[PDB]
Design a protein around this ligand. Structure first.
Ligand SMILES: Cc1cc2nc3c(=O)[nH]c(=O)nc-3n(C[C@H](O)[C@H](O)[C@H](O)COP(=O)(O)OP(=O)(O)OC[C@H]3O[C@@H](n4cnc5c(N)ncnc54)[C@H](O)[C@@H]3O)c2cc1C
Ligand SMILES: Cc1cc2nc3c(=O)[nH]c(=O)nc-3n(C[C@H](O)[C@H](O)[C@H](O)COP(=O)(O)OP(=O)(O)OC[C@H]3O[C@@H](n4cnc5c(N)ncnc54)[C@H](O)[C@@H]3O)c2cc1C
Ligand code: NFU
Ligand code: NFU
Ligand code: SF4
Ligand code: SF4
Ligand code: SF4
Ligand code: SF4
Ligand code: SF4
Ligand code: SF4
Ligand code: SF4
Ligand code: SF4
Ligand code: FES
Ligand SMILES: [Fe+3]
Ligand SMILES: [Fe+3]
Lengths: 291, 437, 253, 253, 291, 145
């Protein structure tokens, strides 16, 4: 068990991509989040999972309890605006009748699940029915109006034409279905970020069973942390079953060196913000949820 | 005549006391069982609130039977506004209802068994104790209640204060997987409740063959006609209920009138008999003044001008002409209701369409018309009445089973040795928070 | 070590809090077998008067115009090492905030307050209904706090700290908590946990942000409790796998 | 004596508070003529930066994600002898409690707090809109507090005390005040004043007791303020005929 | 100006009754509250007044803005349950267009008006438009359910038959239209009283312009305090105009001696209650609005 | 572009002027433009206000009904309403379903006038740019909402 001060607690870290070519056709990166949930369903580690499905406006996610391989695949690809994944957490155990709930989401959503497991506050039956969590890396998120403003104004693209969006190499990238590419400098996006992201002290989904993301791995690949006993059992079985190609992370460039550095910048910048809240006023401060 | 008082009662829900006039032998001549639970006042605070909120507040009258108030309140709103809910909403409400009856009757087994004897012996059940046969009985009861709460949670959204019911039907239908899960659990439960039922009936039959029971180290004789009264019974359905939307409602609001305790309860008395050995902590001190008319916290609903008995025996007497009365007859009738709950769930699941609609397409807002709904709660007829206008509750009234049973059980106390007055009370499975609301 | 002594005290409650405790099933029997003696509970046992307790689980609020109730809640503080406000009525008033008198046969029974306005409260268990698992965790951790090795008592004190902070924060609970102390504070991040915890479906998310039907809300305080931006105690919550295994072992046969 | 110096500071407000001050008509002109100099008010005058003030009338709440706003409200505390939260937004957040971001062209402008959560507030003038007469009484009494004989300064301090207690009580306002702190406290006596003060008709009386449409309430704090069982300071209010004549003489030509 | 510690501030106290024989036919006592408001309207001191009109259930009062002599007379007779008079105070100056508002009510309602005049909190235009207040003596009040319980149970009368109710000589009295009389000992009524009356420190409507009540005067007569300059101007004119018979109070039995004693018992009993609130809990107390 | 707090509504793809001059130009073909013309048009609106009040009072039935007998709850259909606020056309648009607002939008006069007044600044000495602004009678809390 490595206990990293910026990458959290984990057993191993590899670079990986799914061997399911259908999944990879529309996965954001390696298809880890989709492949892990499909496999968990077909093997019976879960009987349903919360995923960011398609919503009612283009590129606006809608949380949904998926119970088939087909419904899980609809959630492929990154939506860079808020998806309130945890709103279906209790309901998954009520009208859906699930015994083994999967949850996907970003770092704060992993935190929400773990708080619910230890301090269930009107969350009956949830502690014991959470079966598997896959956490995405997340530097920051946006309101939907923020995302519209970035894509339509700054990138000058129509949302109905966008095939993929990607934050990497210092730019917000927009790919269209007809084959065009537009970029926006990340400096331009800063005003649009969701303010509650600025106290977040968690980059690589420290509290998930398995965490997955893009940084540290070449395109089409994911950096994966296997963290908990649940996470290790499922990953071992999946690898043994042929579900994934892997490479130890230290044989991969830029790997864990860059990743640990981006995690450190996030925590340091946001810890400072948390500190300034304390003296925000005159002889008064703002609340610290971590106090 | 002397006056003895037990305050508080125990092994029942909520806060009441027994203020008893007894003859020279300690036999009750006239006893009053009365609520001393504070009046939270749900009927008055309801006025002006939304028809969506009032049922969820009324649920919090009681955590054992919240299904009863959630459904009776919602269906009173639906009856006042003229809203007909979809079939699959009704099926889910019935599954919720039957499941809760299982959990409640099984909880009451825990409350009453410490008064009962391991058959053919002089040992009373102590269900806390990690010894047989109590522990295997506790294990069965505990699995029964767990199954029941689980089904309630799946069909009703929450086992305590169900969230799925709403004006017009339900928030959610259930998945194919949930429907299978409820069937699997009901199959398991049916075998268990048949066993628990036979066990309880054997224990009660043994009680009926006893001549005395032990209270505080003394032998207390068991009257043959323990708990007999002449008030008769009232019931609206063997399982679910009835509402003013029905072609032929099975409850008659022109036969009901509610008085204050005044008309039916004793006035001021002074306790002059005290037993400090009554388990565990004794009875009210000599010299205490009591006044049931003024201390009683409930109203007194009547039917044809008289208190009536409600609950499982009332239902079996009304719908099958069950013909035994009193304390042990009440206990018998309650256990006999176990299997109907599981067969009903399974039949409802068999008819449930998991793709079917669960919310009426149109929800009218009401013009001030009166509607009412009866739910046959585990303890008896729970009748909510309402006038909804423009989506707000303009008038609200609640006639709750234990409210009805308070004056009736009081009258059934005559003839009991005061030391087992509490056994007469417990056969009513009292919910004093319900009775008071 | 001995079993700690536990009572259930019933003020103006619905007994749904007690039912929640009981819905731990063989978990409760295990706790009563090995860690705690139930010394008082009118619903389950015949002890008529409030005895001394290590832990008093107090459900319901206090009707100010009911003398015996006021005496009961003062007697309870006097008799108890640790007072737990069990459930949202005891913590925050909940549906009895709306009580306003006028109903037979005590039209003067008008005013209800959470217990913390009459006595000092050590620990909140919020919820309507409260989660069985939470009541169980608190009972186990209270045992460890009183009878464990100093490694356990250190864990127990760290586990309970946010439930003790809630008791010091105040006696009010409402949808508006999420406005006042989360959204209006710059802490909301749109996870939607509040919407899952709400027992009456009063909370929706619109563009990732809480929307409250205040005339449906029954003022239970659940949503602020469950929100991961009310209290998030990293020292405990990041050790979730460990604390889970510890609690489970304490319940194992 | 000199005129005191008064500024109007405008945070996230609607200017209805300023309009209320102006709706004292020749009363305001009389105060500006004889008792006070308006040293700062962007709506009425060209002083661009916050100067020193004896009394700052601050309207609106503070958007935490607007840097200049945060600086303005801190600069105001630094520059002012007496800070008055003028109106329900400044006192209690009011409609900006419901702000949750997401609108063009600043979707990150999400979090608003009453000024008392960022600086110390000496005096509350609650109301949405605040009553012109109240703003006038407070300005007159603040003048007497600073420039009067010690008999006047004693009256002024006693007049303002309940508005200073409100500022120390907290920064929240809602229908539920009347439940929490009046009905639930055993103090409601059914006078119905709350129903008259409510600006949106959210309060009815049912059998003599307040009934609140919480999804109509805009959280202004008016009804608790006006209730004669929030604060009732007998030393002032029983002298109503006298204090009325005193205020009137101070405005007479 | 007498400054009495239990009877408040006043200029004189007389025993009086209206000379209007129509008013007296249904007045509770001397007809002072009705006669003063009718006279104020016809003379133009007020253009409307808040009175306890007839409501929707028998003997349940409903506040109303009366603007005619006929509407004022409908409010005659004591309703011993809550009438929220002040709920129409602001509206009287809005849609009713009144410049000179009269208010009738009991002591706490007089207090509400004076608080509104000095601390208007969302009560614009009310301070300067309150023109005349007449305050009733009041020992305590009841919810409507309390009143039903007292009359129907304790007195055994039908509300639809009651002509007058009266608390006097230690008993709650019920008079029926067909000529019967029933009484209830006041001891029996104590549980029913409105709890908020138990912190009330004001018996003879200390803060009204004119205060009027029954105690101290024979049947059909009222004890009247003239307190403010408004009150003295109107009363002087009304007496000069023939509207009232008077007797100095000290020539009247039982007079001010009994009245000052009942006021003292009220204040002392309720001041004690206010004091006990402070230590009501353990190391905690309840709020004191007077603190 | 980034500091501006408003949206920019357009009509036929361009900013427009709203307010008293816009009303007099649309409905009487008032034919003067610019700062002093805006000021003139605003003062000219004073008497209509008083004649309108008096005519409305003359027609008002003080016993007449003031609430529709039936208030439907909505099916999600879009409706809109324009009020000619003192500063110009104030247009609110809404979809109500089951008594709840499902969609809401506000095009407020000063919102419209912000880009238009900007363009009117060309040619002014910068020291009286503020005089150009004030002829629009700006309400910046309105424009932003
Ligand atoms: C706001 C956001 C910020 C991110 N920032 C980074 C970063 O800084 N560095 C980095 O390496 N990776 C970041 N990621 C993760 C990365 O973009 C991919 O989502 C991740 O690598 C998983 O890709 P995949 O091929 O395994 O998943 P896929 O197979 O394509 O499946 C997509 C998964 O992502 C979930 N998901 C998609 N959108 C959301 C959403 N809005 N909210 C919650 N869950 C969602 C889906 O439920 C599904 O589980 C971010 C993701 C999000 C939503
Ligand atoms: C709860 C209550 C308690 C009282 N207790 C006493 C007492 O202890 N000692 C004593 O001497 N007098 C008491 N009174 C006053 C007395 O009963 C008469 O109301 C008073 O003498 C005025 O009578 P009148 O002939 O001048 O008025 P009338 O001409 O008969 O006119 C009646 C007036 O009383 C007002 N009024 C009637 N009911 C109410 C009500 N519920 N709430 C507010 N205003 C109302 C009406 O608006 C009207 O102004 C009490 C009155 C009330 C409402
Ligand atoms: N069963 C039941 Fe309740 Ni707790 C009762 N009595 C009611 O409806
Ligand atoms: N006039 C005006 Fe407002 Ni304060 C503007 N602009 C709007 O509708
Ligand atoms: S930066 Fe943190 S708070 Fe914001 S969406 Fe990502 S994991 Fe959540
Ligand atoms: S918190 Fe909820 S379940 Fe607990 S006593 Fe109160 S109403 Fe019942
Ligand atoms: S649970 Fe908390 S952080 Fe998450 S959406 Fe609700 S208020 Fe915002
Ligand atoms: S919104 Fe829901 S969870 Fe939050 S306090 Fe209200 S009823 Fe409780
Ligand atoms: S308190 Fe009301 S009138 Fe004053 S700034 Fe706020 S919205 Fe405007
Ligand atoms: S103003 Fe105060 S005392 Fe009067 S009715 Fe309203 S809450 Fe009760
Ligand atoms: S109920 Fe009315 S007066 Fe009271 S806080 Fe709400 S809007 Fe303001
Ligand atoms: S006793 Fe006091 S609080 Fe009660 S109704 Fe009379 S004047 Fe009002
Ligand atoms: S305080 Fe929330 S209505
Ligand atoms: Fe009832
Ligand atoms: Fe807009």
């Amino acid at each position: 068990m490595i206990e990293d001060p910026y990458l959290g607690k984990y057993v191993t870290c590899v670079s990986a991509r799914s061997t399911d070519k259908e999944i990879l056709k529309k996965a954001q990166d390696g298809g880890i989040a989709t492949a892990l949930m499909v496999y968990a369903l077909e093997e019976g580690f879960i009987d349903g999972t919360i995923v960011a499905g398609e919503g009612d406006k283009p590129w606006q996610p809608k949380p949904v309890v998926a119970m088939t391989r087909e419904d899980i695949l609809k959630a492929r690809g990154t939506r860079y605006n808020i998806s309130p994944q945890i709103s279906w957490l209790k309901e998954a155990t009520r009208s859906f009748g699930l015994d083994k709930v999967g949850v996907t989401g970003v770092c704060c959503q992993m935190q929400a699940v773990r708080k619910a497991q230890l301090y269930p506050i009107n969350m009956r039956d949830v502690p014991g029915k959470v079966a598997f969590t896959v956490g995405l890396f997340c530097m920051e998120n946006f309101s939907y109006k923020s995302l519209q403003s970035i894509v339509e104004d700054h990138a000058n693209q129509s949302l109905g034409s966008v095939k993929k969006m990607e934050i990497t190499k210092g730019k917000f990238w927009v790919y269209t279905e007809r084959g065009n590419v537009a970029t926006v400098p990340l400096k331009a996006t800063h005003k649009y970020e969701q303010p509650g992201c600025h106290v977040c002290l968690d980059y690589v989904s420290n509290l998930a069973d398995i965490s997955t993301g893009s940084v540290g791995s070449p395109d089409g690949w994911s950096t994966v942390f296997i963290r908990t006993k649940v996470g290790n059992e499922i990953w071992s079985k999946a690898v043994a079953d042929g579900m994934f190609e892997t490479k130890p992370i230290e044989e991969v460039k830029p790997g864990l060196d860059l990743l640990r550095k981006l995690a450190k910048q996030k925590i340091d910048k946001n810890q400072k913000t948390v500190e300034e809240r304390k003296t925000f006023g005159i002889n008064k401060g703002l609340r610290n949820p971590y106090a | 005549t002397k006056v003895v008082e037990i305050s508080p009662t125990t092994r029942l829900e909520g806060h009441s006391k027994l203020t008893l006039k007894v003859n020279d032998q300690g036999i009750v001549e006239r006893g009053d069982w009365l609520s001393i639970t504070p009046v939270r006042g749900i009927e008055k605070l309801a006025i002006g609130k939304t028809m969506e909120q009032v049922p969820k507040i009324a649920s919090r009258v009681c955590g054992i039977c919240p299904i009863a108030h959630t459904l009776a309140s919602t269906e009173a709103m639906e009856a006042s506004i003229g809203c007909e809910i979809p079939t699959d909403a009704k099926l889910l409400r019935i599954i919720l209802h039957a499941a809760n009856r299982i959990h409640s009757h099984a909880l009451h087994n825990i409350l009453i068994l410490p008064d009962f004897y391991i058959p053919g012996t002089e040992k009373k059940f102590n269900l806390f104790a990690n010894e047989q046969p109590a522990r295997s009985v506790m294990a069965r009861i505990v699995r029964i209640r767990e199954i029941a709460q689980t089904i309630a949670a799946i069909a009703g959204g929450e086992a305590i204060h169900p969230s799925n019911p709403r004006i017009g039907g339900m928030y959610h239908n259930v998945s194919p997987r949930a429907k299978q899960k409820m069937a699997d659990l009901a199959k398991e439960c049916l075998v268990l409740v048949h066993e628990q039922m036979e066990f309880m009936l054997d224990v009660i039959r043994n009680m009926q063959n006893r001549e005395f029971v032990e209270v505080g180290g003394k032998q207390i004789p068991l009257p043959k006609k323990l708990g007999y009264h002449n008030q008769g019974v009232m019931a609206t359905a063997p399982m679910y209920g009835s509402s003013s939307l029905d072609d032929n409602p099975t409850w008659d609001f022109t036969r009901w009138k509610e008085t204050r305790p005044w008309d039916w309860y004793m006035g001021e008395v002074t306790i002059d008999l005290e037993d400090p050995s009554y388990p565990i902590g004794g009875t009210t001190k000599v010299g205490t003044k009591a006044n049931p008319q003024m201390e009683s916290c409930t109203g007194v609903p009547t039917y044809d001008g008289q208190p009536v008995e409600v609950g499982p025996r009332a239902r079996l007497a009304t719908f099958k002409n069950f013909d035994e009365k009193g304390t042990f007859a009440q206990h018998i009738a309650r256990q006999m209701e176990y299997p109907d709950c599981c067969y009903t769930i399974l039949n409802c699941l068999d008819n449930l369409n998991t793709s079917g609609k669960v919310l009426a397409d149109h929800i009218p807002q009401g013009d001030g018309s009166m509607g009412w709904a009866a739910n046959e709660a585990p303890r008896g007829s729970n009748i909510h009445l309402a006038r909804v206008k423009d989506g707000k509750v303009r008038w609200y009234d609640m006639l709750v089973p234990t409210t009805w049973n308070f004056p009736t059980c009081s009258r059934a106390l005559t003839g009991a040795p005061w030391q087992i007055a509490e056994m007469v009370v417990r056969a009513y499975d009292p919910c004093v928070s319900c009775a008071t609301h | 070590t001995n079993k700690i002594k536990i009572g259930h005290v019933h003020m103006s409650g619905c007994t749904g809090c007690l039912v929640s405790l009981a819905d731990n099933n063989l978990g409760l029997i295990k706790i009563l077998d090995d860690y705690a003696d139930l010394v008082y509970c009118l619903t389950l046992a015949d002890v008529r008067h409030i005895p001394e307790m290590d832990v008093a689980l107090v459900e319901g609020s206090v009707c100010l115009q009911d003398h015996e109730s006021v005496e009961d809640i003062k007697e309870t503080r006097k008799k108890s090492k640790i007072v737990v406000a069990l459930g949202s009525c005891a913590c925050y008033g909940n549906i009895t905030r709306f009580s306003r008198g006028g109903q037979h046969n005590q039209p003067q029974h008008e005013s209800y307050l959470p217990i913390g306005d009459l006595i000092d409260v050590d620990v909140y268990i919020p919820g309507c209904p409260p989660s069985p698992e939470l009541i169980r965790n608190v009972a186990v951790m209270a045992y460890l706090l009183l009878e464990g090795n100093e490694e356990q008592k250190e864990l127990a004190g760290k586990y309970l700290k946010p439930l003790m902070d809630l008791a010091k924060r105040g006696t009010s609970g409402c949808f508006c908590d999420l406005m006042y102390d989360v959204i209006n504070q710059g802490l909301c991040m749109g996870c939607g946990t509040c919407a899952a915890s709400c027992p009456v479906h009063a909370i929706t998310l619109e563009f990732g942000k809480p929307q409250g039907e205040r005339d449906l809300c029954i003022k239970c305080g659940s949503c602020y409790g469950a929100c991961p931006r009310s209290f998030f105690n990293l020292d405990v919550i990041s050790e979730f796998e460990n604390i889970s295994e510890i609690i489970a072992k304490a319940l194992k046969d």
